[PDB]
Amino acid sequence: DRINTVRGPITISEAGFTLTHEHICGSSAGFLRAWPEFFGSRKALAEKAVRGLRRARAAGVRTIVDVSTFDIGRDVSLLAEVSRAADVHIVAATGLWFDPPLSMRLRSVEELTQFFLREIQYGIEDTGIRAGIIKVATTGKATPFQELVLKAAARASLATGVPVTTHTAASQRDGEQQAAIFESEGLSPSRVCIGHSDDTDDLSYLTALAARGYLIGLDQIPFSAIGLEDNASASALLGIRSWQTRALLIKALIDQGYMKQILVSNDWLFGFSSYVTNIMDVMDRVNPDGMAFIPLRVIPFLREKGVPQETLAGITVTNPARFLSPTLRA
Amino acid sequence: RINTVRGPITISEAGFTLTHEHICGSSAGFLRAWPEFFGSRKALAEKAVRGLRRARAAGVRTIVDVSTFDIGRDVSLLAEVSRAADVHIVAATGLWFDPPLSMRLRSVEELTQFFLREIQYGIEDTGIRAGIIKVATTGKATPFQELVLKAAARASLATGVPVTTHTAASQRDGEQQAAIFESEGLSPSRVCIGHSDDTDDLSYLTALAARGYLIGLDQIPFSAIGLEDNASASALLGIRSWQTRALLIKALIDQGYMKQILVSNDWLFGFSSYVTNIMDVMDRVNPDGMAFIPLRVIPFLREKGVPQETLAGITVTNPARFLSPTLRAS
Ligand SMILES: [Zn+2]
Ligand SMILES: [Zn+2]
Ligand SMILES: [Zn+2]
Ligand SMILES: [Zn+2]
């Protein structure tokens, strides 16, 4: 009956409209503290984040889930600062993404389980801030280390009730192997979001996962390099499908009967250091609305396509609350 | 003056100096996220303080902690143990073998700016300035490692701070490193070619020394003799005896290169980037820790006929000439 945020526990009712896959800053462990000038300054980054969260809040957002892991350079002290300033709840994450350092890559399943548990049950670093979600990643068939991470995430979820959310390459149908590994651990699909699922046009891939009880993360809705296709780096990151094509997958899954299984987000951020230097600016040029893109553009778009407001409130309020509220078994 | 974690020191203050050491071999952010890996931060600090006090009692006055950003260098911890043990510690900038994406994606100009920040401004928000630049290859340089070497040469050329390297001596890495450094105009007198004790190729070593390079014979206690079937320890430590490594010091002395020699242990008080208990295995191999050089190597060389004055030149005179900022130490 409580969800952990960077400001402490909140009720299901307090979470309200929740974006389930976002970032304050996509970076690397230790990088923000070592080279804040990469972002102009820590101050400038903080300011940009407060502005964006305030705009999001004005558009209706009440909570974001920051799925930045240790190796995404998650700085929960920065999260707490911006959450306070903007009055938007922020759920922090544990887990590991694609850039684990050696001190992580060398660890056993038992050790990784202890680390994820520490961040959920005790706190992150010395902040006392506890993670409310576990983030994991594969890009095609899991490496041996990625298997350890998936197993450890499942075990941490099974001991705490905190859910697991994933990065996939939806083209490579990764959710299928992620699912297989989670189920081998006894994890309920009700505690798992298969993320970046909006990157495919193969509806049958999505429906098969949904039929199994998985949550489906349609979470890069504004990602498109339409208008900048000759920007190789931007095209690689954003793809060449329109935001409308991505958004229409939400309607497609509603129509199949899977509205309760849908989670929607922007996968936005206010700083971004793990890619080409100015990728943040390019992204802002693509989507000036930032995190407010879902409420301001996507919801009205789906309404115009015939989706009732009530269904959209279900997807953006009810589903996230059911996903996040700790349980074995949602 | 030479920048230490406690402030700039004069040449006269440096005394007996171990030029390639670590307080803790880890990964960026790792110590702060998972201090229990080390028992606790307190336990790690106590172990480091005990170890430095032992080194000091054996005559050590300064160590150069060549831990980079990606070795998880925590300069706040360095300052803490430096003050507690009364041993000078020089901190490092540069990059080693585990750069995260936020480093790997950076250009030569951006890396140069980062290294310069840590030398001229300070490390993180601590105001502690680096007194050396650490770089690394394992065989032929990767494209990224080339950028790191070029950026290190540029930062050295702007500041007078020297560059020290990790090599695979068996692959004669020193020759490519030298070539890249000189293609940037760097004086060999500002460069220590490190881990040079893992070779029997005296002609490779003397050729470099003759060109003005400093030769880092810096892993003298590294040996898995008595634990050869420990795959992980033998991979890290090798099977070359400590006596063989030490006799290379005498070999270079006997060929007239005493002024080009730098000696050290490459020791540490915590180690998280390898197998979990590697620190224990290492302490079982070399209970003297950083006091191995003064307690074991020096008397061994004395017994082999090397005059004390030569050993003082190597352990006191050479490191001071190496560390004191210049563009040409001659
Ligand atoms: Zn992702
Ligand atoms: Zn993301
Ligand atoms: Zn090394
Ligand atoms: Zn080292």
Curated annotation (Swiss-Prot), chain A:
PTM note: Predicted to be exported by the Tat system. The position of the signal peptide cleavage has been experimentally proven.
A GO MF label: zinc ion binding
Binding note for cofactor: Binds 2 Zn(2+) ions per subunit.
InterPro entries, A to Z: AryldialkylPase_Zn-BS (IPR017947), Metal_Hydrolase (IPR032466), Phosphotriesterase (IPR001559), TAT_signal (IPR006311)
EC numbers, comma separated: 3.1.8.1
Keyword Transcription regulation in record: no
Main localization of the protein described in the UniProt heading: membrane
GO cellular component: plasma membrane
Residues that, per the record, bind Zn(2+) 2: K135, H167, H196
Subcellular location: Cell membrane
Biotechnology: Has attracted interest because of its potential use in the detoxification of chemical waste and warfare agents and its ability to degrade agricultural pesticides such as parathion.
Catalyzed reaction equations: An aryl dialkyl phosphate + H2O = dialkyl phosphate + an aryl alcohol
Modified sites of kind N6-carboxylysine: K135
Binding positions (Zn(2+) 1): H21, H23, K135, D267
Cofactor: Zn(2+)
Keywords annotated in UniProt: Cell membrane, Hydrolase, Membrane, Metal-binding, Plasmid, Signal, Zinc
Membrane topology label: Peripheral membrane protein
Superkingdom in the source lineage: Bacteria
Any one of the GO BP annotations: catabolic process
A UniProt-annotated Pfam family: PTE
SUPFAM superfamilies (alphabetical): Metallo-dependent hydrolases (SSF51556)
Family, similarity comment: Belongs to the metallo-dependent hydrolases superfamily. Phosphotriesterase family.
Record's subunit section: Homodimer.
Function, as annotated: Has an unusual substrate specificity for synthetic organophosphate triesters and phosphorofluoridates. All of the phosphate triesters found to be substrates are synthetic compounds. The identity of any naturally occurring substrate for the enzyme is unknown. Has no detectable activity with phosphate monoesters or diesters and no activity as an esterase or protease. It catalyzes the hydrolysis of the insecticide paraoxon at a rate approaching the diffusion limit and thus appears to be optimally evolved for utilizing this synthetic substrate.
Name by which UniProt lists this protein: Parathion hydrolase
Species for this entry: Brevundimonas diminuta (Pseudomonas diminuta)
Name of the encoding gene: opd
